[PDB]
Each structure stands twice: as C-alpha cells, then as structure tokens.
Design a protein around this nucleic acid. Sequence first.
RNA 1: GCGGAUUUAGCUCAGUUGGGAGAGCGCCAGACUGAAGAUCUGGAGGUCCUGUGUUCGAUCCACAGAAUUCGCACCA
RNA 2: GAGCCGGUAGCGGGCGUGGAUCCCUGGAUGUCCGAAUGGGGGAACCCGGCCGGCGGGAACGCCGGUCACCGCGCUUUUGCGCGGGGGGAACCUGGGGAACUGAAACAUCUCAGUACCCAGAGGAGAGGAAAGAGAAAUCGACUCCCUGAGUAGCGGCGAGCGAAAGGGGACCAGCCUAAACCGUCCGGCUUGUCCGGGCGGGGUCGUGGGGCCCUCGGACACCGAAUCCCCAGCCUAGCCGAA
RNA 3: GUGGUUCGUGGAGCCAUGGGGGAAUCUGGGCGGACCACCGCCUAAGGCUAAGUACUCCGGGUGACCGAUAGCGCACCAGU
RNA 4: GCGUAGGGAAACCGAGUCCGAACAGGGCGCAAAGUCCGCGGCCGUGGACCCGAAACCGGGCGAGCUAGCCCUGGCCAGGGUGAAGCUGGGGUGAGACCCAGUGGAGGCCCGAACCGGUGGGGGAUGCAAACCCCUCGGAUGAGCUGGGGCUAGGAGUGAAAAGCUAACCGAGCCCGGAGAUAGCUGGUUCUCCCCGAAAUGACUUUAGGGUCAGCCUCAGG
RNA 5: AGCGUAGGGUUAGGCGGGACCUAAGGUGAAGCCGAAAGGCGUAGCCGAAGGGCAGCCGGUUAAUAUUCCGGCCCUUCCCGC
RNA 6: CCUGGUGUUGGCUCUUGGUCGCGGCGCGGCUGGGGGCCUAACCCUCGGAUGGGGGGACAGCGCUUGGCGGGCAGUUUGACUGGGGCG
RNA 7: GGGGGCCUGACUGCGAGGCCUGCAAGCCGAGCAGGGGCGAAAGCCGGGCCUAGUGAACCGGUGGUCCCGUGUGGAAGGGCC
Lengths: 148, 73
Amino acid sequence: MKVIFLKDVKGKGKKGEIKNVADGYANNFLFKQGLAIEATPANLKALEAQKQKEQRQAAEELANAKKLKEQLEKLTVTIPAKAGEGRLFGSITSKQIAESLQAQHGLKLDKRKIELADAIRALGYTNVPVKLHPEVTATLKVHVTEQK
Amino acid sequence: MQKDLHPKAVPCKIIYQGQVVMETMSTRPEIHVDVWSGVHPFWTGEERFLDTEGRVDKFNKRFGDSYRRGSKK
RNA sequence: GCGGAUUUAGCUCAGUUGGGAGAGCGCCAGACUGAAGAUCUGGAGGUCCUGUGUUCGAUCCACAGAAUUCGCACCA
RNA sequence: GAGCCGGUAGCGGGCGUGGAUCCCUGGAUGUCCGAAUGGGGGAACCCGGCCGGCGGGAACGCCGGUCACCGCGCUUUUGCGCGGGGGGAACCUGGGGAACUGAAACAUCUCAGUACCCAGAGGAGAGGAAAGAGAAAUCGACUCCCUGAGUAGCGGCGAGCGAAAGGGGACCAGCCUAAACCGUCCGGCUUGUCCGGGCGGGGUCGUGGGGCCCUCGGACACCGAAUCCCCAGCCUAGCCGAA
RNA sequence: GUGGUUCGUGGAGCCAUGGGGGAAUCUGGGCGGACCACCGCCUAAGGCUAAGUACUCCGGGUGACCGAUAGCGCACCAGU
RNA sequence: GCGUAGGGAAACCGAGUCCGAACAGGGCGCAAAGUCCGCGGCCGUGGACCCGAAACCGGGCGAGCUAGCCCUGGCCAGGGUGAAGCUGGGGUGAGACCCAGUGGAGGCCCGAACCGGUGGGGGAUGCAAACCCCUCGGAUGAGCUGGGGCUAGGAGUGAAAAGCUAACCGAGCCCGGAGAUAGCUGGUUCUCCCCGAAAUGACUUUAGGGUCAGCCUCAGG
RNA sequence: AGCGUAGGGUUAGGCGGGACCUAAGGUGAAGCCGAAAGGCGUAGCCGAAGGGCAGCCGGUUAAUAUUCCGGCCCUUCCCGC
RNA sequence: CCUGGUGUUGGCUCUUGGUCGCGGCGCGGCUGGGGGCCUAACCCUCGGAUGGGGGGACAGCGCUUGGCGGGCAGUUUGACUGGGGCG
RNA sequence: GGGGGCCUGACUGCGAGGCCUGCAAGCCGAGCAGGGGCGAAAGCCGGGCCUAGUGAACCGGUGGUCCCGUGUGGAAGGGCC
C-alpha cells in the first residue's frame, strides 16, 4: 500500500512517511477520512516539490544570515547616550539595540536575538554575542558612551 | 445488463465437474459431473454525472474507485 | 501390498542416565477360618520379538524381517 | 397511337388524334388500427391544453388545423437541435444452449455447439497488417475454393471424432489514435512545475516517436469514402423491322 | 477452476478468461508446445478497413422438371 | 494421389531385411506392372428397401374444462324442536340451585326450489360420448351461486384415489429435434432360362438375433 | 319457415356504458434485482349489475319504444342582471 | 444445507503453542491458537429527514474445500428355464 | 516306482514338422548354435508319469534398453525387453 502519509502513523508526522497501511484497510479508513493520499505520480512529485521548496527556504535564509553576517561582524557598534563616569543613567537595552543601528546604521534586525544577560550600562567597548541565525550569529562589537 | 462491473465484464460461463483422479501417480483417471454455474465479484457505492452510485465489483473496483475513468466520487 | 502406530512375567502394562529387569493382577503360599472369602505376609513371574552390529557394558542406539493394528492407496 | 369508363359480358350515360385508354418516373392527397408515442384502452374505439375559421350561430356559437410519448447527443443557460427503436422467407455473428440415437446396455462419448430461444449488425455481416506461422535463417493481412488428409492425432484407444503450416487458385491493400516528450491553452489546486480537456507535434505497418546540434531539402504519391459530367446499367412502355 | 483447439485431465502448450496475488518501457517483454541453456521469430494489454466466399423475398434465363390424387399443399371470388 | 522395392516399434538398412549373435525361421525379392474412366453385383456413412408404436428433449399454446385461492353481488317457499339469557316466584346468610314465564341459538330436525347424483328400472349404431324413470342424502351452512380475476400444466392444484387440469393428464396440447431408434410386425412389384439350399457346430447381458465354419452360385486355372 | 330473392324496420339532457371513484388484480415515470428476453413495483391511471347519478303513464305502425306522439315531473352547464 | 482458507472483512489491547538459531530458561525471526468495546466496509435499523440507533468484520455475499444429500435427474437390476419366478 | 552321489537346462537364440481347429488358443517335437551338468564313456537334461492347478487387449508399477525425444543440447514423456 503506497500510503502517502499526511499526519500520524503514531501521530501527525506528515513528513515523508509512506507506510504500507495495506489494501482497503489503509485505503478507506485513512484517506476516505482525509489524511494524505496514494502514490499518484502527481504527488510523489507533490512531496518532492515541496521538499525542494523547503530546500530553498533554508539554504536561502542561510544566504540571508550570511550576508548581514560578514558585513555586520566587521564594522562598529556606536551608541553614545548620557552618563557620569561608568555608568549610564538609563542602562542600555538590546531594545535601544534595534531602534538605532537599524534606523541609523541601516538594516532591520530583531531584538529577541542578541545574547544579553541584562541591561549593560558600562558604556563604551563591551562586545555582545548577538544570536543572528539559528546556527550562525554575530558576536559584534559595541562601543557606547555618554556623549556627555 | 445489471449484474456486471461497469469498469469491465466478468460474469458468466462456468463448466465445472468433479471426478476421481488417481493418475500419473499411478494408473488412470475417470469422469462424471456435467453441470454449469456462475462465478464473479461484488459491488460498492459511488457516483457519477449527477448521482448514480455505480456498482461494479472488487478488482476493477479497487481501480477506477481509487481513480475514476468515466466518473469519480 | 502405501503410510503411521507398537514388540518386556501366565494376563494387562510401566520402564529416559546405556550399568538394578520392574509394577499391578493376577497367580502360588503363610498367617487367620469350622472351611473357603475378605484383610495382612511373602514368593515366583523372563527368548525385554529374532539376528547381526555399535559400546567397557544394550530392554534402550543402528541395520532387515516379521506380526498386530488403523487409515489409503485400486481401470490389468 | 387512335380507342375507352378496370375482372362484368347487362341496363342508363358519356371522353377522346387545337397528342384519350394505358406503359414510366417524380408528385399532392393518404380516413381508423398497428413500434404508436398526447392521454386511455377488451387494436382498428373513446378521452384532454394552443391556434384556428370565427362558423347555422335565419332573432343564435363548431369542426378543422394542431399539438405535445420515451430512452440518445449535448451551446450546459430555461437545455434548444440531431439519431433510435418496429419489421423481414433464407443467410450472418455474438449471448445462452438439449435429450433422443449411435457406442447393438449405459454413467465417459456421439448426435453439436446441432435443433431451439435471445440480442443485434448488414446487404452481406464473419473476420482483417501478426506478442502470426514454422524451421529450408523459409514464409508473411484476413477470407474463400481445391489440396494437404480421412493423414499428424484425440479416446471406457471402443463407437466415432478428426487439425494445420506448406503448394495450386479467386482477391489484393492500406491506415490510425491514449499513445504526456514538445509546445497551445482552458479549468481547477490554490501560483508554479498537479491532475484536467479541446489544438497541433508525433499521431509507430514489419521498431520507433520526441527533444538538441550540423547535412536537409527547394512539384505528379490520389481512398473505404469526397467530387464532376463520362459509357451514368437498369428503371415500363422505346421501334423499325427480308420474302 | 472451466473454454476453444485434433488434445476427453493427460509428459500437455499457445490464445481466451471465473477468483487471488498484482512486473518490466528496447540488453524491455511473449513466443517456437513440461522445463533449461543457446539460437531463431515477434513486438501485444485501443480502433477503421471496400474486393475474393453465403443466402434467395424479389426480376430474368434455362430444363434427358412436372401435368391436374404429379408439381408449392394452394393454375385462380384458398392458407379461404 | 494411387502403382515405381520392401522389411522394421524405431534408429535405419535396403532387392535385402528384422530376432539374435546366428548362417535355423517370419516378412518379402523373384517385375507379369498398373492406372484412369465407363457401365454393374456389393460394402461404409448416410432418413436410405417403405410405412409402424409406447417415449425423451425445446419453444410456445390454455381456469369461458375443472381444482383452488383473492375481490364483489345475489340466493335458501313453508314448518318443527325449544339451550345462554332476561322477568317473576321458590326453604338458607347471600347463594348454590330448583320451577314457571318469556325467549329464540344450532354446520339441529321434517320437508320445495336449489345442491346430489348411493339403491333398483330403462337406454347400449341411445334423446345423449352420462342422459330419462322410479328412489335417496344435504336442506343458515367447512351452504348453493352469478359477475369480475390469480395461479398452469415435471409444474399447478388437490378435506388427496394419483384425483382434475378444455370430454382417455401415472406427468397436458400444438409446432420443432425428426422421416428419433424400432433383433419385432407387416408390406415387398413384368416374363423366362439354369442349378440347386439349411432348420447343425463353435463364442456371445447371446439365445425367435448374429460372427466364423458347414451345405449354394457364377469367373478363371 | 326461425329456407330463397327484394324492400323496409330499431331515434333518448333525464334507461343502460363512458364523458366520476377505487379493493383484488393489471399496468405502471421514479426505485429495486436478471447472461439477454426479463422480475418486481410507489404514486398516478386501467378495473364492475360494488359506489355514485337528473322522470312517469297512456297513445301511436308491418316491425321500434322509459327514446315517436302528447299530457304531467325534473337536472347540469353558460351569459345577463 | 454444514464446512476449512480467500476477498471489498478496518483499529486497539489481553494471550498461549510451534519452530529453527543464538527436560532449559533468557532472547531472537519466524508463525500458529485465541479474548475483548470499539469501527470508519458491510448489513440491518428506525422511530416522524440524509442523523441518530443496533449488529460489525458478522456476515450476507465471490472464489476454491470438504460433507452430508432419492429432495430431485439420468442409467442399470444377465442366460439358461422341456411356461416366468423360487429352486 | 524305493535310496545315495554330485548337479539345476525348473536354459537363452530357435525350431524341420505335426496333432485338435470356424477364432484365437491349446498341444508335440528331432535337430542347429552359445553355455553348462551327469557319466570313463554310447547318451539323457530345455522341471515333474500324464490329461485339470485357468484368461484376451487394452488401463497402469517396477529392474533392464540407451530405439523416439515434437528449434538443436537434454529431461517430462514414449516406443522395445
């Protein structure tokens, strides 16, 4: 039985799970129900079409987390707020993160990323291992300052 | 004609007849019966060109049913 | 005659560790009885189907027959 | 080419060479039944919508025409426009399909796939370019006649049944489409690359088809029809016609 | 498990199929009579195809074919 | 296609061959050679010397026959017998229960039409393919009935003998297999010449058939 | 002559059948099953001295008659108001 | 008519048997028996609609197995024989 | 016909030539060859003193052949013993 999965087999895993459900058995109860279909070359193309589409959405987004990547890990990270002789009066959040570099420096980037223990403040040079792409990120430099 | 398949015919003929073997494995065979009977499949419900339901049997049924060569479900 | 089932005491049968030949009977005897029976004691019971072979040793393992029995095979 | 109102010869009356009777072919009527079909029904009868004159409607209102069964395609829209079915002596294939009787019984066998019934095609259907035949590396459509052959062979090896290739002959004759490969699109899913159906490519005769790259190459090859008059044959009477 | 075939169960194939499994797209896939090697043939599982043979209701032709109890039974107000 | 060799299961050999390992026999060699045709006595397939039955099998045909069953009407002149009941009276508590009145059932009795058809009479080329005469049973009922229909002929129906199913159903009737087979039965034609039969023996699901012999006849040596 | 030839005879708004109704049963669009022919079969329809429906008495010919005469009794449809 | 395997006759779990391999037990593939609501076929059900309900892997029903089986169908059941038979 | 000695011809290949005979059967048999046994040897032996102890042909089993083998190599299968 060329059972073209669409969910379960234990659950739902509609992920390349063809299983000899068996004759009318798997035939009637599984898909009559509506939960995938049979070989049908069309599909046996359907699955691969879209496993290939998925294949573009990963390596691509791989090429999207590799362009900002290098371009990003080279230049600076300047954000001179106010302060006294250390620390700022309103710490420094990766929130104030995005906002700047973006608008200013330019390219849009998240604010859930960047690996921040808390709201620094120590102004000036203090790098921040910023989690960009799932496997590859950006431990960039950050030089703040109380422009005074 | 209302006892066939739609997706092909298979009904009729059937020249049965039993005997009492006992050959090649020694000596020779014999004869008897002289009857004639039927022999076929079964039918399920479907539909085509505005309702119709269909019928035809297994085999075939497993087919077109899955697909449909003149009307689906 | 094609196949299966077996072969031990007078009868009916156990017997698998390859080394004791066993049980029941039933049978015989003793005890008991007025005797016999019933009970208790005891005893015997032998071609382990035959032959040959294997083995230190064969009821047991191996090799034909045979016989009994059941089913089947039947167009000379 | 000059007689006629049929077989009726009879009474009573009449058409005709300013081409009658009749011979032809194409017509217009074709009452009622019968597949019947508008509806019903014991056939040859009795019943209904639309149009219809308007008709005696003497100062009072009708037949005629018509029309429409149902299964088939499908311009689907509210479905408008095409085909069918009933026959038919004999013959044709399919669907189904038997005892007698022979075997000097009779269960195998035979009569047979006959007789019959059913459906349906035709004027002929049957069949028909081969996963064929056989073995000389030989043959080639199908069919039918002779022959092969009462042979090879089937079998209570009994009664019987009993092929075919090859050779001779009649005839000849070849073609298509799914056949997703290409492009065209139309409709969906839901945008891609899925299935879908109309257009061509090809649409295979005896192994090919596409798609790519260079040689191409640049008019006689008609089928089962399609067509024109042609001799259109016949279609009944055509008419002379030696003494 | 039946068919047809000369094949009546047979050493018994090809083609056709009643039920059940359910391959391949040219070194593919049946075939040449159990099977197997090698050789040889063919390319299926859609379709159309006049002509060559059959048959007489019809019309004609012809008869070592008939004559009214023969011929079709029925030669003429007969399938009555 | 028969003859031109054949011999053999065959391989195959071949005027020789198969058995075999032996020159012992079987088949044949030895040409004598046919072949086609015509005309005949016959033999097989044929319906096949000619008609003859009871039956089997196919497709139709019928409940205006009759047996049923469904639907729907009609019909039983008179009379007789007298149960449930209800009314009243009756010794006990009520009653059982008795009696008397009324009352009117019952596949009930006596009998017409109507349904039938034992028991005798006639009739026997009848009046008739079941009828006439005298006689008899049933006589509000598994009652008789008209009209409408349903079933069906290897199947129906059947208060059931194998009855009835269009006047003889032990499995209807017509057309078809078909001119079934038919050791039995008959039937089996113009003259004349010639000779002249058997009625036994052997084997038969064979004995009143028929194979082979024995006895006939014609052609040649 | 209930035999031959010839001529002639039977008339209905109200009698009967239909122009109304259904049970059996038969048909039968749909629906259901057959190798084919076919089987069944809803609703609707067919189906009768069962249901329903508006008259009777006398006269009058060679024959008819509740129809023809006449005297008496009615019903349904339509148009008008 | 009864009957094994097979089919459109789908899920979930409870289990014992064989087997060969690595009296035994541990495992292992193999495969056999079987007990369960379910349940999406199937069928039936209906009860006022197409949904519910009940049964449910049944069974109907198809294919092969085997069995009963005079209910029916077709044949048969010799000869002799100083009559047919019995003998 | 009664014992004892070794011995098995209680043979294969065949049989000239007859008995009985419609059929098929049935039955006999010198002698020829290969190969033995018994006897010195001349010879006898192809079961019995005989005449009953029986069966067609096909339907098959099996030990031998290496005859056929359905395109050739073979085998299923078949023919012959």
